[PDB]
DNA sequence: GAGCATCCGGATCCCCTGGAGAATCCCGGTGCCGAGGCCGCTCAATTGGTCGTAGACAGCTCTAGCACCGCTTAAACGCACGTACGCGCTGTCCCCCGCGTTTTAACCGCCAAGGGGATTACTCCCTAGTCTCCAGGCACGTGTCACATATATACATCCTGTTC
DNA sequence: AACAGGATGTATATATGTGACACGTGCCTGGAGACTAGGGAGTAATCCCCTTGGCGGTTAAAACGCGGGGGACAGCGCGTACGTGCGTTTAAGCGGTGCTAGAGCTGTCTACGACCAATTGAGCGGCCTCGGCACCGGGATTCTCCAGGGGATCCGGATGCTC
């Protein structure tokens, strides 16, 4: 812990702390890596260049951040807050431990049928003139539970019945007729 | 017949069977070739050639047995030129 | 010891194969001899566990190789 | 025109590069002083060397027949082509340690002497093998007959391995 | 969820030759017999040297837990490198002839056995003296700690859109 490493090069590091103002959302030094982690939007995670780009909006170009990132990753590993994926498909992709619980691997079918219906919902009205409406094709029950038509139909009735506000119920015949009006514009008839 | 697993079938047969694996006369002309440089017109009997062949076969088999264990040591299966270097030197032969 | 191998080998007369088998089987006999060459002795089966891919030849992750 | 979190260029600061003086360390290079190799006197049995003769192993001479270098076709093995996935090699960091740095004083270690037991010289006597000096039975070849299990074949019929 | 396909491993009786033994003769050499004979061992006294411990006095090698760097184990993966499938060709055995010397008969010389005394070597055997080795005081050698003006690249800040 020699002087040429504790006082000679130090002044740069304490001088630049907790000042990532340009990214207003969570500018804390410890939270930049984590903010990149939620912003990545991928199962594998963020690799080195991905995390560097996601952190880089301003205030960060890397005079010493290239090695400071490795040092912070070592600190986060000592804290046990990092979960990652190996392989050459993802060149050291990293994630923060966001309770995305690890479990046994086997049981990976080569399709995702439940989300396979979403692209068709995106495509069909968008291919039509009437743009993609609000997520009304399937309700919140779609990821509440996973059941067939009778159980996915009885529950919306309870959803609407438990909300007994007449004023709230008035909106279902004032926000929906907009679709009826737009059905005149997008197709020429019916 | 997968080539990797068929070789296992050969191992069972060749280990069970007892025979001279290398050709006789090509080995017989081989030992004669070496003798000429050492001593010109050095003759060989039938028994001498077979005795040399059997000793050579056993010596090569033992080296193959040792090099096989060198491959699994390196988390591998096939024999590479590095395997024969480690086995020979560690026996005190190469150096 | 060799004579017992002949019965296991479905043969009456002792062949050089049984001489190797008797010596190799007895570990004490290995110390006495075994750094030698036996004419037509053969080799005892010594298959290693690194071979024989008992697991399915398909890839661990999925069926595709 | 505003409000909010994604990018873009403005201006003030400090760590790469480099050459030394700071005072530490650890490691090389002279000083110093004991102990194991020598030199010189004697002390004597091993042990070469000498004097003088006798009993066999082995290079010549060459013999008689068996075991290898060519002859002479007849079958079967090995050698050669391509195509494919099994499996090197790279890239990468879980994650689990080998190594550095300090306590920590007890353990390895050498100094000044004795004893009881055990390993070589010296003397006596003794029972196997070892020349005499001959004898007879086993056990190895050369003919002469005559067989027994190994090594692969005809029928007849299941287990194993590697794909789709 | 599990059947097809072609060859290898099974029983079962079926052929052959070479490996094996049994006669019948024949003849040294390897065991056996039975004493006389000289030399390695059983068995008695002698004598110093070897190991077992007293018995203290510093000092350099263990014994152990914490720290922060990093290297072995292990995951996938795209492309390189080696073992099946099918074919003709030319390398291997036969196995009677023929031709070298290995191996086996004669008879003589030679260096090597063997008794018997003198005479140089070369450690013992207790007596003195010496030159490089090894321990121990001094500093020399790369890394380690400092002081300087500022610089180029960063952290500090300037600037962009649709209901």
From TrEMBL, chain B:
It is found in: Chromosome; Nucleus. The keyword Heme does not apply. Keywords: Acetylation, ADP-ribosylation, Chromosome, DNA-binding, Hydroxylation, Methylation, Nucleosome core, Nucleus, Ubl conjugation. Residues 3-90 form the Core Histone H2A/H2B/H3 domain. Signal peptide: none annotated. One of its GO terms (molecular function) is protein heterodimerization activity. GO terms for cellular component: nucleosome; nucleus. The keyword Ubl conjugation applies. The nucleosome is a histone octamer containing two molecules each of H2A, H2B, H3 and H4 assembled in one H3-H4 heterotetramer and two H2A-H2B heterodimers. The octamer wraps approximately 147 bp of DNA. Belongs to the histone H3 family. This is Histone H3.
TrEMBL record, chain C:
The lineage of its organism: Eukaryota, Metazoa, Chordata, Craniata, Vertebrata. Signal peptide: none annotated. The nucleosome is a histone octamer containing two molecules each of H2A, H2B, H3 and H4 assembled in one H3-H4 heterotetramer and two H2A-H2B heterodimers. The octamer wraps approximately 147 bp of DNA. Transmembrane segments: none annotated. It comes from the Eukaryota. Its main location: nucleus. GO terms for cellular component: nucleosome; nucleus. It comes from Xenopus laevis. The chain holds residues 66 to 130 of 130 of the full protein. Core component of nucleosome. Nucleosomes wrap and compact DNA into chromatin, limiting DNA accessibility to the cellular machineries which require DNA as a template. Histones thereby play a central role in transcription regulation, DNA repair, DNA replication and chromosomal stability. DNA accessibility is regulated via a complex set of post-translational modifications of histones, also called histone code, and nucleosome remodeling. Belongs to the histone H2A family. GO terms for biological process: heterochromatin formation. This is Histone H2A.
């Amino acid at each position: 812990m020699t002087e040429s490493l504790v006082l000679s090069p130090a002044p740069a590091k304490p001088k630049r702390v907790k000042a990532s103002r340009r990214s207003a959302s969570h500018p804390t030094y410890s939270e930049m890596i984590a903010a990149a982690i939620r912003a990545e939007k991928s199962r594998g995670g963020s690799s080195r260049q991905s995390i560097q780009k996601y952190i880089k909006s301003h205030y960060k170009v890397g005079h010493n951040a290239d090695l400071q990132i490795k040092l912070s990753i070592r600190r986060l590993l000592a804290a046990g807050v990092l979960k990652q994926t190996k392989g050459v498909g993802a060149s050291g992709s990293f994630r923060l431990a966001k309770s995305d619980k690890a479990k046994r691997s086997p049981g990976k079918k080569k399709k995702a049928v439940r989300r396979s219906t979403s692209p068709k919902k995106a495509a069909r009205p968008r291919k039509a003139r009437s743009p993609a409406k609000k997520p009304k094709a399937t309700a919140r029950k779609a990821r509440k539970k996973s059941r067939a038509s009778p159980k996915k139909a009885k529950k919306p009735k309870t959803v609407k019945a438990k909300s007994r506000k007449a004023s709230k119920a008035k909106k279902v015949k004032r926000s929906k007729p907009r679709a009826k009006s737009g059905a005149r514009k997008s197709p020429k008839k019916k | 017949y997968r080539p990797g697993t068929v070789a296992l079938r050969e191992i069972r047969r060749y280990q069970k069977s007892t025979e001279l694996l290398i050709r006789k006369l090509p080995f017989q002309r081989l030992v004669r070739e070496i003798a000429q440089d050492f001593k010109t017109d050095l003759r060989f009997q039938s028994s001498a050639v077979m005795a040399l062949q059997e000793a050579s076969e056993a010596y090569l088999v033992a080296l193959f047995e040792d090099t096989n264990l060198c491959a699994i040591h390196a988390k591998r299966v096939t024999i590479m030129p590095k395997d024969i270097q480690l086995a020979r030197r560690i026996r005190g032969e190469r150096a | 010891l060799a004579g017992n191998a002949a019965r296991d080998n479905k043969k009456t007369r002792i062949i050089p194969r049984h001489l190797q088998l008797a010596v190799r089987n007895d570990e004490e006999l290995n110390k006495l001899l075994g750094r030698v060459t036996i004419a037509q002795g053969g080799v005892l089966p010594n298959i290693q566990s690194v071979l024989l891919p008992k697991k399915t030849e398909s890839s661990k992750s999925a069926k595709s190789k």
